[PDB]
Amino acid sequence: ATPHINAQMGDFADVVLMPGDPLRAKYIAENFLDNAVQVCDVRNMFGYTGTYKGRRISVMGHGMGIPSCSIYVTELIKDYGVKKIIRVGSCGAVNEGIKVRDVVIGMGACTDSKVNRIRFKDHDFAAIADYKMVKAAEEAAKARGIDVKVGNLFSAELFYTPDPSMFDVMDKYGIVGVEMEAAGIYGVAAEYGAKALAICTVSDHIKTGEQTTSEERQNTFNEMIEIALDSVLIGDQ
Amino acid sequence: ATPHINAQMGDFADVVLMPGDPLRAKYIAENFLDNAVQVCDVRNMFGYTGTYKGRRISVMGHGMGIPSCSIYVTELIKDYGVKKIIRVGSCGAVNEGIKVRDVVIGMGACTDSKVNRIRFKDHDFAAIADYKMVKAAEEAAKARGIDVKVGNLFSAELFYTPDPSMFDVMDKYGIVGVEMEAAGIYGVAAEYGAKALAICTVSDHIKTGEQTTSEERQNTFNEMIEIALDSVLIGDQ
Amino acid sequence: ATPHINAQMGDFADVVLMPGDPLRAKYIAENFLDNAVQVCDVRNMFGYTGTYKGRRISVMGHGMGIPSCSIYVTELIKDYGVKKIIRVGSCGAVNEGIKVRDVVIGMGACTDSKVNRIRFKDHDFAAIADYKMVKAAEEAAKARGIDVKVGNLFSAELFYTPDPSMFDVMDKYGIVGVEMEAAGIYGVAAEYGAKALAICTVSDHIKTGEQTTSEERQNTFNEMIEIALDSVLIGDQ
Amino acid sequence: TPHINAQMGDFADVVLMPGDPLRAKYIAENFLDNAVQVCDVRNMFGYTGTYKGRRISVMGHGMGIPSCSIYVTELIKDYGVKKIIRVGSCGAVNEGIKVRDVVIGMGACTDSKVNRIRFKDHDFAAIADYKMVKAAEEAAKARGIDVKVGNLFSAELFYTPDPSMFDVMDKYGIVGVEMEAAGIYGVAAEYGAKALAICTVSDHIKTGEQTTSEERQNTFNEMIEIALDSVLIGDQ
Amino acid sequence: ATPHINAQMGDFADVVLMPGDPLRAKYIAENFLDNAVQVCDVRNMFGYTGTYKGRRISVMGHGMGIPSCSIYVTELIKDYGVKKIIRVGSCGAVNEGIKVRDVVIGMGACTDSKVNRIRFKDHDFAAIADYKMVKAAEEAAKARGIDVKVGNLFSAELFYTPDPSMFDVMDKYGIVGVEMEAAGIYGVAAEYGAKALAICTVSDHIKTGEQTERQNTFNEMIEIALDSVLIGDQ
Amino acid sequence: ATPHINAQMGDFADVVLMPGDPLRAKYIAENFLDNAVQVCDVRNMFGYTGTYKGRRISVMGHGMGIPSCSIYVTELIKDYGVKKIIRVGSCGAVNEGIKVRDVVIGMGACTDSKVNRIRFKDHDFAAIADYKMVKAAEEAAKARGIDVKVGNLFSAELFYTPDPSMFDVMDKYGIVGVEMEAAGIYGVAAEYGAKALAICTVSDHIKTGEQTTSEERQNTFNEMIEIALDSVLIGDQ
Numbered sequence A, B, C, F: 001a002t003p004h005i006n007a008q009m010g011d012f013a014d015v016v017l018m019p020g021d022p023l024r025a026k027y028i029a030e031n032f033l034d035n036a037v038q039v040c041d042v043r044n045m046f047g048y049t050g051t052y053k054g055r056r057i058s059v060m061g062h063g064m065g066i067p068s069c070s071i072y073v074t075e076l077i078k079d080y081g082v083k084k085i086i087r088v089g090s091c092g093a094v095n096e097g098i099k100v101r102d103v104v105i106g107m108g109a110c111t112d113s114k115v116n117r118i119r120f121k122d123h124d125f126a127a128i129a130d131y132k133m134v135k136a137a138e139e140a141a142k143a144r145g146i147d148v149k150v151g152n153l154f155s156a157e158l159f160y161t162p163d164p165s166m167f168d169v170m171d172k173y174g175i176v177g178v179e180m181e182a183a184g185i186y187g188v189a190a191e192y193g194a195k196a197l198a199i200c201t202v203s204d205h206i207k208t209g210e211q212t213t214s215e216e217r218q219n220t221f222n223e224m225i226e227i228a229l230d231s232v233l234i235g236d237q
Numbered sequence D: 001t002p003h004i005n006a007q008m009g010d011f012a013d014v015v016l017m018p019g020d021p022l023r024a025k026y027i028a029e030n031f032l033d034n035a036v037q038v039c040d041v042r043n044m045f046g047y048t049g050t051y052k053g054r055r056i057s058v059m060g061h062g063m064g065i066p067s068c069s070i071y072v073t074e075l076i077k078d079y080g081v082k083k084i085i086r087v088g089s090c091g092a093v094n095e096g097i098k099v100r101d102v103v104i105g106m107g108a109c110t111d112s113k114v115n116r117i118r119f120k121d122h123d124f125a126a127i128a129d130y131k132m133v134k135a136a137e138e139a140a141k142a143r144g145i146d147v148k149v150g151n152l153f154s155a156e157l158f159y160t161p162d163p164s165m166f167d168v169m170d171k172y173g174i175v176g177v178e179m180e181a182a183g184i185y186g187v188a189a190e191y192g193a194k195a196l197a198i199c200t201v202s203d204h205i206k207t208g209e210q211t212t213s214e215e216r217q218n219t220f221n222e223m224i225e226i227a228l229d230s231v232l233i234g235d236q
Numbered sequence E: 001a002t003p004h005i006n007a008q009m010g011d012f013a014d015v016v017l018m019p020g021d022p023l024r025a026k027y028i029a030e031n032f033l034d035n036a037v038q039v040c041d042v043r044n045m046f047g048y049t050g051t052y053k054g055r056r057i058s059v060m061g062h063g064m065g066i067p068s069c070s071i072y073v074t075e076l077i078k079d080y081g082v083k084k085i086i087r088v089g090s091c092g093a094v095n096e097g098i099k100v101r102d103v104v105i106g107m108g109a110c111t112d113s114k115v116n117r118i119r120f121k122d123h124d125f126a127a128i129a130d131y132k133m134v135k136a137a138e139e140a141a142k143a144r145g146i147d148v149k150v151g152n153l154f155s156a157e158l159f160y161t162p163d164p165s166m167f168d169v170m171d172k173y174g175i176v177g178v179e180m181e182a183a184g185i186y187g188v189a190a191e192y193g194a195k196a197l198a199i200c201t202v203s204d205h206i207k208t209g210e211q212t213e214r215q216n217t218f219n220e221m222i223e224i225a226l227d228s229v230l231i232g233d234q
């Protein structure tokens, strides 16, 4: 009943996992959730609701970029009663302390977008995740024997950046991964009084160009999804 | 062979029509082009290539927002040799001189995004369409007896704006419609040396809120697509 | 009587051609208009009114720079009822696609001035000409065998720029000519609800170094004025 | 160094920092064992002692981003300090936060231009070190104190010419207004160290709630104990 | 010869007085200088050179606005060897401490232009006059019994401002007068290593509405400027 | 009392000299004023009131940086009735025309702080001293046979700057010394309707690293203080 989501109140759980690709949302629903049913498909932005260890959880794509994910997250919170959003994505690393296949958590998200300046009187709004969600994801990873790197993501406006020198600045300031949405999701969560978190797997190294096999990448993605879902159960305690 | 488009050089025509919704690209391909074949589907962002009165033309969604459409348009130009991009979308009107169902052409596109400042040393880049494309579209509309309003669109960053007072500023400055991509597409076209145009139909009036029936809405969209396709042929003369 | 123009309502036609030099306004009035009379001379900024094929047309200098031309154009519109402004100027080229002696039209005008940010809540206002005026001038030129380059002008704040590296950015982004007024005139036209256009002749090339003579310049200037005047009649329909 | 008259080794690798050098003196004398003064240039007192056997330093940072940046930069680059815990006071702007509450700035918003100077005029999210935040929250839980973790706002002008900004801070959930965390976090990122800002809410900017001097001192004491306990948890 | 000035090196003195109106430059040269000769007239922007008590002094219009005066002042400094520029203009008042007919001096000039940010890495450049020139003008005025108001001018980009509320901010911050050039002239003087000063007469009040006497006050300003040149030389 | 000053109205003279270091305020009070009594000590920011040649004068530290000195100066003006503030400090030189041990006066103060943009609608506020105070200080130095250089200081935000290239821009633009407070003090004086001046001695040459003995340094500081105190008496005439 919203312009970008053809669902009804109650169709989504109060916690929604969101990759950018709607086909990754389909993959998560089919392989990690039990009895997941599709709840939306406007603009092919697929969303599903099923259970994980008996707990109701939804998964839906958010598209690429701050403006796209802002629309979906805003509607989920204000029109569907969603309380927590976990972006589950991929990112490029810029620092030598971070390696391909690492799992990173954006406790903060830097950005070159103007959206938070539009909201915050042109001052610096520190786009941050919800602390308890970060803690739950780090504890879930520790229980699985995975060491997550917690720090700042960089949410880029231009994937094909006209300023590649900025990657060196990100490296110097310890950015853990480059993606295009966390700062926008965090801005919406603060504006609408909800909670969010962005967890990402490092799929490529922007500075080194390091590569891996498709199998290795899929394995890391799977590990990250399990951590996100386990974190929901820890968060419920 | 690109990260967001699973196609190969030659799969796309040198002219691509792009609505934001991939399902609208599917509708255009099936109802306005002859023998259209799907050429891409990564992230469900459907793209097709067929013919219009014998002329090869492609149609593909671009997603929502400047960062999303920037990725697709940049890849089409630099990896697929696309020369002209015609965004075919919907927009909201803010001025009394514009009415619901009107067809508007963005000769320019204002914006609250920082992408053009990132490209243009933080000065004011006037994000403009290619003049010959604007002229071809206006002449195509004239041949069909369809009135068009040529002026500035406003490409917004936040659909759910925290600053609705900006709509009054847009009104005063003669903005013809509010959408979320034209300024970004125009910036990419200038950066990569290609040509673009954004043609939109007014679906809602942000101030009054005029109303229509589904049929009327569909009829106006069809009019916009015929103008756009006809403009390609005129542009080739 | 305004502070910068010592004329009375009705002294100016509803269309005014404006070069920066008042002596060029004089040359236009005396050699291209019939029965031209001087209507203003405050600060030596000469303005005249005469006829072209029986149609009333005015010509007046606007001085140099955005703040200067803004004063004159605002007064012409708000105090003298002027509806259309045609800047008839000179500019320097920065792109190799543009040659000296070429006639360029600013469908848009980029700038490093803060005037449009002051008007548009610090967002990006695309400073644009009126489409119908652009089309009339392009058609007038085409009828005379002159191929006008329609694109973005760059209206500079500092003729003696402390940042010459910006010329390379202008070149990359396709700027057709460098002058110091179009973006300001376009901003005034949008603010006051009037229409404007800037047509310029390329006097020199900033990138390659190509220069011109006084004779070549004079010949090209005459052509520009003939195009501008014919465009007024086309615009009248 | 130009602002610290000490020598390498005089400071522990963890330094607690209130803005007032006299609060640093109070902490050294009442919470640390055998604390000795290690610096006094510009009256910015710093001390080193032990807490439950662990070496810990405490030093004032002055008021405002420029002042605390000088001291924190010197501590990290010239004295080998690895972790900085600002232990201060702040004003609340949101109804969800009460006077006497203990807040932790996982992030710090600001109207300063310092991070823009560092980060190509883009938005650097000034953040604390996660493990330090977690240790402080766990230390507070062990003491039966509920901490509110979120964004501080590090102001440039205490006597702001724009009081309407407090309403924007309230709307965006800022937990407290102080004048340093965003600057400390920017230095920590630039110099590769770790920081955290924990503050007690001493006043409510929106409501004006009052409390006795005794109540404020008790809350300050509680917060210092949490910060020191957090160092021990962080060492594990 | 330069693109905007059709003179030759040596035609201008090392000190140039500049009003915005070229006709005011003409008036100054004919009534306050001896043996004044016109040295330039491109775009009708008249410039002259004559003497004041035997000392060579030039006078030339600068046009309206920062970009316009920047072109003329830059060329005078870099192509004609000018060392000092004295803008002699008119301005509007916004503060109740300033009255119409007052003579004000911009020791600083605030602005809404982006030119000094373009020059100064987007930081805040305080556009200032040369101190010794300010002092010379203030002392010249004091000797004549004229009490000059020395402070900040505001050099506006838009005469017909879309933001009139900014006049209340100028008033609160003590701006002494609103004109459209001083911050640009000061920016050029710093960039090129020269010296400048902007002295203006208050033609009217923006806050109270008091209107205006102009000729008499203008004459006084020019007398102060000229005497300030000789003091500056000593 | 005020939050940062434990004094009462009347404890401070109407003129206050302010070094950044409270121990330098103590030194000035004990060695240059007669019968100075300490009037405040909150946060160890010592302030004193005594007489100089019979004239009541106060001296108090202001701490380091714009935000710190802004608090103290604002409270002195609005709560303690102070009319004139004379910052007496040290600075670093960037220009060859300035030498170590020189005494410089900030008629203006440039800055990279955002405080004056926050006050002045994001435009350029020229942070300036009060002219009569500047003149009094220059005349006081002349009486003592001490040459002074009057120009623009640069009030830095980051002592350990991440952008040392800005020192070359400061040099080119004639900056006479680099400190961290004058622009802030000047902004407060304008906002609160008071008067201020910053006089500094060059302690180091950021470009050459010029050097001296402690005795020479102490001698130059004493010279600056004598000039400052003498300027108060001249200012009263």
Ligand SMILES: Nc1ncnc2c1ncn2[C@@H]1O[C@H](CO)[C@@H](O)[C@H]1O
Binding pocket: A020, A063, A064, A065, A089, A090, A091, A092, A093, A156, A159, A178, A179, A180, A181, A203, A204, A206, B003
């Ligand atoms: N290096 C990267 N830069 C930007 N976005 C990235 C990168 N790697 C992965 N992504 C993610 O995938 C998309 C871009 O391919 C974005 O939506 C973002 O979430």
Ligand SMILES: Nc1ncnc2c1ncn2[C@@H]1O[C@H](CO)[C@@H](O)[C@H]1O
Binding pocket: A003, B020, B063, B064, B065, B089, B090, B091, B092, B093, B156, B159, B178, B179, B180, B181, B203, B204
């Ligand atoms: N009023 C509107 N504001 C913003 N985008 C709009 C509007 N109306 C239609 N759109 C279009 O549809 C999407 C937002 O629903 C955007 O991708 C944009 O192209």
Ligand SMILES: Nc1ncnc2c1ncn2[C@@H]1O[C@H](CO)[C@@H](O)[C@H]1O
Binding pocket: C020, C063, C064, C065, C089, C090, C091, C092, C093, C156, C159, C178, C179, C180, C181, C203, E003
């Ligand atoms: N290269 C150029 N840069 C700026 N303005 C130019 C240039 N060439 C011509 N002009 C025009 O002439 C004037 C500057 O000589 C301006 O008013 C502008 O209209």
Ligand SMILES: Nc1ncnc2c1ncn2[C@@H]1O[C@H](CO)[C@@H](O)[C@H]1O
Binding pocket: D019, D062, D063, D064, D088, D089, D090, D091, D092, D155, D158, D177, D178, D179, D180, D202, D203, D205, F003
């Ligand atoms: N309301 C407040 N606003 C700003 N700083 C505050 C506030 N309350 C406490 N502080 C702290 O105390 C000092 C200002 O009194 C700052 O250094 C800051 O750390």
Ligand SMILES: Nc1ncnc2c1ncn2[C@@H]1O[C@H](CO)[C@@H](O)[C@H]1O
Binding pocket: C003, E020, E063, E064, E065, E089, E090, E091, E092, E093, E156, E159, E178, E179, E180, E181, E203
């Ligand atoms: N109120 C005013 N605002 C702007 N410029 C003014 C004002 N009064 C006088 N001037 C001067 O006259 C011109 C505008 O009339 C400018 O060039 C400026 O020097």
Ligand SMILES: Nc1ncnc2c1ncn2[C@@H]1O[C@H](CO)[C@@H](O)[C@H]1O
Binding pocket: D002, F020, F063, F064, F065, F089, F090, F091, F092, F093, F156, F159, F178, F179, F180, F181, F203, F204, F206
């Ligand atoms: N080179 C310098 N850069 C910045 N501040 C300086 C410098 N030299 C002296 N200072 C002064 O001393 C302090 C920094 O050491 C500041 O408060 C400032 O007043």
